[PDB]
Short mmCIF file of C-alpha atoms (C1' of nucleotides) in Angstrom, two decimals:
data_model
loop_
_atom_site.label_atom_id
_atom_site.label_comp_id
_atom_site.label_asym_id
_atom_site.label_seq_id
_atom_site.Cartn_x
_atom_site.Cartn_y
_atom_site.Cartn_z
CA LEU A 6 -32.54 -12.12 4.90
CA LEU A 7 -34.67 -15.03 3.68
CA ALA A 8 -36.26 -15.24 7.14
CA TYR A 9 -36.74 -11.46 7.14
CA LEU A 10 -38.72 -11.64 3.89
CA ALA A 11 -41.26 -13.89 5.63
CA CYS A 12 -41.91 -11.56 8.58
CA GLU A 13 -41.62 -8.21 6.80
CA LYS A 14 -43.85 -9.03 3.80
CA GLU A 15 -46.14 -11.90 2.82
CA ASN A 16 -43.73 -13.03 0.08
CA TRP A 17 -42.30 -16.51 0.58
CA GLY A 18 -42.03 -18.26 -2.77
CA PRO A 19 -39.70 -21.00 -3.93
CA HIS A 20 -36.11 -19.80 -3.67
CA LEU A 21 -32.92 -21.06 -5.28
CA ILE A 22 -29.34 -21.33 -4.02
CA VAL A 23 -26.35 -22.45 -6.09
CA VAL A 24 -23.75 -24.14 -3.88
CA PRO A 25 -20.60 -26.14 -4.69
CA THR A 26 -20.97 -29.89 -4.31
CA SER A 27 -18.97 -29.92 -1.07
CA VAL A 28 -21.03 -27.40 0.93
CA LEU A 29 -24.33 -28.85 -0.28
CA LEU A 30 -25.06 -30.50 3.08
CA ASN A 31 -23.87 -27.56 5.21
CA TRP A 32 -26.75 -25.43 3.91
CA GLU A 33 -29.38 -28.05 4.81
CA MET A 34 -27.88 -28.73 8.25
CA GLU A 35 -27.55 -24.96 8.62
CA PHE A 36 -31.23 -24.60 7.65
CA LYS A 37 -32.23 -27.03 10.41
CA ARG A 38 -29.85 -25.35 12.86
CA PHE A 39 -30.78 -21.76 11.93
CA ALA A 40 -34.34 -20.75 10.96
CA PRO A 41 -36.15 -24.10 11.36
CA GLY A 42 -39.48 -22.89 9.96
CA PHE A 43 -38.38 -23.07 6.31
CA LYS A 44 -39.23 -25.95 3.97
CA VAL A 45 -36.00 -26.90 2.20
CA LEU A 46 -35.33 -29.49 -0.48
CA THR A 47 -32.03 -30.84 -1.83
CA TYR A 48 -30.75 -32.32 -5.09
CA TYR A 49 -29.24 -35.80 -5.44
CA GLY A 50 -29.58 -38.73 -7.80
CA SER A 51 -29.92 -36.87 -11.11
CA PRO A 52 -31.10 -39.84 -13.25
CA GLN A 53 -33.59 -41.25 -10.72
CA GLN A 54 -33.81 -39.56 -7.30
"C1'" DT B 257 -27.77 -151.59 -87.08
"C1'" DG B 258 -24.63 -147.78 -84.70
"C1'" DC B 259 -21.03 -144.62 -86.27
"C1'" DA B 260 -17.59 -141.36 -88.14
"C1'" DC B 261 -16.75 -138.24 -92.28
"C1'" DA B 262 -16.79 -135.16 -96.36
"C1'" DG B 263 -18.97 -131.40 -97.85
"C1'" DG B 264 -22.81 -127.87 -98.04
"C1'" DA B 265 -25.56 -124.11 -95.43
"C1'" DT B 266 -25.48 -120.67 -92.78
"C1'" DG B 267 -22.47 -116.37 -89.14
"C1'" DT B 268 -19.08 -113.43 -87.88
"C1'" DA B 269 -15.53 -110.87 -86.71
"C1'" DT B 270 -12.26 -108.90 -90.15
"C1'" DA B 271 -10.59 -105.67 -93.62
"C1'" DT B 272 -11.75 -102.27 -97.31
"C1'" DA B 273 -14.05 -98.39 -99.82
"C1'" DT B 274 -17.23 -94.62 -98.52
"C1'" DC B 275 -19.94 -90.55 -96.20
"C1'" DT B 276 -19.97 -85.80 -92.69
"C1'" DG B 277 -17.38 -82.38 -90.12
"C1'" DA B 278 -14.09 -79.71 -88.94
"C1'" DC B 279 -9.41 -77.77 -89.45
"C1'" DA B 280 -6.40 -75.34 -92.79
"C1'" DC B 281 -5.18 -72.00 -96.61
"C1'" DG B 282 -5.98 -68.17 -100.41
"C1'" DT B 283 -8.68 -63.62 -101.25
"C1'" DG B 284 -10.20 -58.09 -101.55
"C1'" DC B 285 -13.59 -53.69 -99.57
"C1'" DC B 286 -14.71 -51.77 -95.45
"C1'" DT B 287 -11.99 -51.28 -91.69
"C1'" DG B 288 -7.43 -49.34 -89.46
"C1'" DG B 289 -2.69 -46.30 -89.67
"C1'" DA B 290 -0.96 -42.31 -90.24
"C1'" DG B 291 -0.04 -36.95 -91.56
"C1'" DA B 292 -1.33 -31.95 -90.69
"C1'" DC B 293 -4.42 -27.74 -88.35
"C1'" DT B 294 -6.84 -25.97 -84.78
"C1'" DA B 295 -7.66 -24.72 -79.34
"C1'" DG B 296 -9.76 -25.28 -75.48
"C1'" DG B 297 -9.19 -28.39 -71.79
"C1'" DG B 298 -5.60 -29.97 -68.68
"C1'" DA B 299 -1.18 -29.17 -65.78
"C1'" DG B 300 0.81 -25.60 -62.62
"C1'" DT B 301 1.00 -21.75 -59.34
"C1'" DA B 302 -0.44 -17.59 -55.74
"C1'" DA B 303 -2.76 -16.41 -51.83
"C1'" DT B 304 -6.37 -17.91 -48.50
"C1'" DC B 305 -9.11 -18.94 -44.64
"C1'" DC B 306 -11.06 -21.81 -42.15
"C1'" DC B 307 -12.37 -25.22 -39.36
"C1'" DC B 308 -9.46 -28.40 -37.17
"C1'" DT B 309 -5.99 -29.53 -33.49
"C1'" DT B 310 -1.99 -29.77 -29.11
"C1'" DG B 311 -1.28 -31.66 -23.98
"C1'" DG B 312 -2.95 -32.53 -19.52
"C1'" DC B 313 -4.35 -31.70 -14.93
"C1'" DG B 314 -9.02 -31.71 -11.54
"C1'" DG B 315 -14.58 -32.78 -10.62
"C1'" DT B 316 -18.64 -35.00 -11.69
"C1'" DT B 317 -21.97 -37.61 -14.03
"C1'" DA B 318 -24.09 -41.31 -17.02
"C1'" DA B 319 -22.86 -45.18 -19.10
"C1'" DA B 320 -20.22 -49.38 -19.08
"C1'" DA B 321 -18.84 -53.62 -16.27
"C1'" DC B 322 -19.43 -57.49 -12.86
"C1'" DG B 323 -22.11 -60.79 -9.83
"C1'" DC B 324 -25.59 -63.94 -8.30
"C1'" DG B 325 -30.78 -66.57 -8.45
"C1'" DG B 326 -33.32 -69.55 -10.97
"C1'" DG B 327 -36.97 -70.07 -14.32
"C1'" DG B 328 -38.11 -71.37 -18.11
"C1'" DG B 329 -36.73 -72.84 -22.43
"C1'" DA B 330 -33.15 -75.40 -25.22
"C1'" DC B 331 -32.27 -80.04 -25.64
"C1'" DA B 332 -31.43 -85.32 -25.27
"C1'" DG B 333 -34.35 -89.98 -25.36
"C1'" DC B 334 -37.87 -92.62 -27.23
"C1'" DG B 335 -42.21 -94.67 -29.32
"C1'" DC B 336 -45.64 -94.22 -33.27
"C1'" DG B 337 -47.63 -94.53 -38.24
"C1'" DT B 338 -48.39 -92.86 -42.30
"C1'" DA B 339 -45.84 -90.79 -46.11
"C1'" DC B 340 -42.98 -91.12 -49.27
"C1'" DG B 341 -38.86 -94.74 -51.16
"C1'" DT B 342 -38.62 -98.69 -54.03
"C1'" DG B 343 -40.16 -101.96 -57.44
"C1'" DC B 344 -43.28 -103.80 -61.30
"C1'" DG B 345 -46.60 -103.34 -65.88
"C1'" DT B 346 -49.24 -100.41 -68.74
"C1'" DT B 347 -49.96 -95.74 -71.89
"C1'" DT B 348 -49.51 -90.97 -74.26
"C1'" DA B 349 -46.86 -88.53 -76.28
"C1'" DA B 350 -42.29 -86.28 -77.35
"C1'" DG B 351 -38.05 -87.10 -80.95
"C1'" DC B 352 -37.25 -87.29 -85.01
"C1'" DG B 353 -37.37 -88.05 -90.43
"C1'" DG B 354 -39.50 -85.55 -93.80
"C1'" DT B 355 -42.84 -81.37 -96.37
"C1'" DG B 356 -45.38 -77.28 -98.30
"C1'" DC B 357 -45.79 -72.37 -97.32
"C1'" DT B 358 -45.27 -67.58 -96.08
"C1'" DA B 359 -45.12 -63.44 -93.61
"C1'" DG B 360 -42.27 -61.28 -91.19
"C1'" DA B 361 -37.04 -60.44 -90.71
"C1'" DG B 362 -33.41 -57.90 -93.06
"C1'" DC B 363 -30.31 -54.65 -96.29
"C1'" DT B 364 -30.94 -50.12 -99.18
"C1'" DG B 365 -32.41 -45.03 -101.79
"C1'" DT B 366 -35.23 -39.86 -100.31
"C1'" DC B 367 -35.96 -35.98 -98.16
"C1'" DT B 368 -37.51 -33.67 -94.73
"C1'" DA B 369 -38.66 -32.53 -90.43
"C1'" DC B 370 -35.81 -31.33 -87.31
"C1'" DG B 371 -32.55 -31.22 -83.93
"C1'" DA B 372 -27.18 -29.79 -83.62
"C1'" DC B 373 -24.50 -25.14 -83.26
"C1'" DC B 374 -24.35 -20.04 -82.14
"C1'" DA B 375 -25.57 -14.33 -80.62
"C1'" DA B 376 -28.99 -11.41 -77.18
"C1'" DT B 377 -32.08 -10.77 -73.06
"C1'" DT B 378 -33.43 -11.63 -68.49
"C1'" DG B 379 -35.95 -13.45 -64.75
"C1'" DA B 380 -36.43 -17.15 -62.20
"C1'" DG B 381 -33.44 -19.27 -59.35
"C1'" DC B 382 -29.44 -19.10 -55.95
"C1'" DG B 383 -26.36 -16.77 -51.87
"C1'" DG B 384 -27.65 -13.89 -47.46
"C1'" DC B 385 -30.55 -12.74 -43.58
"C1'" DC B 386 -33.54 -12.58 -39.57
"C1'" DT B 387 -37.23 -13.40 -37.47
"C1'" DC B 388 -41.55 -16.40 -34.48
"C1'" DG B 389 -44.69 -20.33 -34.38
"C1'" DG B 390 -44.15 -24.90 -34.42
"C1'" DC B 391 -41.28 -28.00 -31.75
"C1'" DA B 392 -38.59 -30.24 -27.38
"C1'" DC B 393 -39.19 -31.85 -22.85
"C1'" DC B 394 -41.60 -32.63 -18.79
"C1'" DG B 395 -45.36 -32.16 -14.85
"C1'" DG B 396 -50.53 -33.71 -13.57
"C1'" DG B 397 -53.50 -36.94 -13.67
"C1'" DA B 398 -56.29 -40.68 -15.34
"C1'" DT B 399 -55.90 -45.24 -17.25
"C1'" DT B 400 -54.44 -49.65 -18.10
"C1'" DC B 401 -51.50 -53.46 -17.20
"C1'" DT B 402 -49.06 -56.95 -15.27
"C1'" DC B 403 -47.43 -59.60 -10.47
"C1'" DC B 404 -48.42 -61.98 -6.48
"C1'" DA B 405 -51.40 -64.21 -2.61
"C1'" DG B 406 -55.35 -66.98 -1.13
"C1'" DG B 407 -59.32 -70.46 -1.51
"C1'" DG B 408 -62.58 -72.40 -3.35
"C1'" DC B 409 -61.87 -75.73 -5.71
"C1'" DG B 410 -60.25 -79.93 -7.54
#
DNA sequence: TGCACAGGATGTATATATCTGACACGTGCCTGGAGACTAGGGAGTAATCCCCTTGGCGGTTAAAACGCGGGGGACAGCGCGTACGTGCGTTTAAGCGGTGCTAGAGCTGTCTACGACCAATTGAGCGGCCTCGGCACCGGGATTCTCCAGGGCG
């Protein structure tokens, strides 16, 4: 769906996903596996990183 | 002539009468001791409600805890000299005995403002409420600010 929004319309935008702490990496690895053309960040190191 | 003595001519602690100071005892007028009436302030109870707990699993984070390098600052050793410690003689001035005063300190009537005590009104101040503009927190970016490596210089 997120990849369909890029081809169908011109809307990209910053998105947000809320994932449990265990599956946090599976969405990044899944974003490199599936649909490489997206720019994805992650969240670690609350006080500093 | 050189010498010991008997008595006067001065000291000196010794014993006696004498001068303050403080403890001890005998009063009578402003205190306490006590008796009765009023009453409102204190002891006692009936809900109450309201925030404050009970007990312990896990997941995760921010804060607490440990560990080593070493850099600089606490700290011991030691020499110097001038700044007070110590000891004299010389002076200015307080302690103290005594004096003449006064002007302010100190106890007592008058009344008179004038504040203590008590009804009537209310309005300005307190419980309740519900908003929004100032406030909380952080990005963007410029600015300063300290840390480290030559090198030109000793």
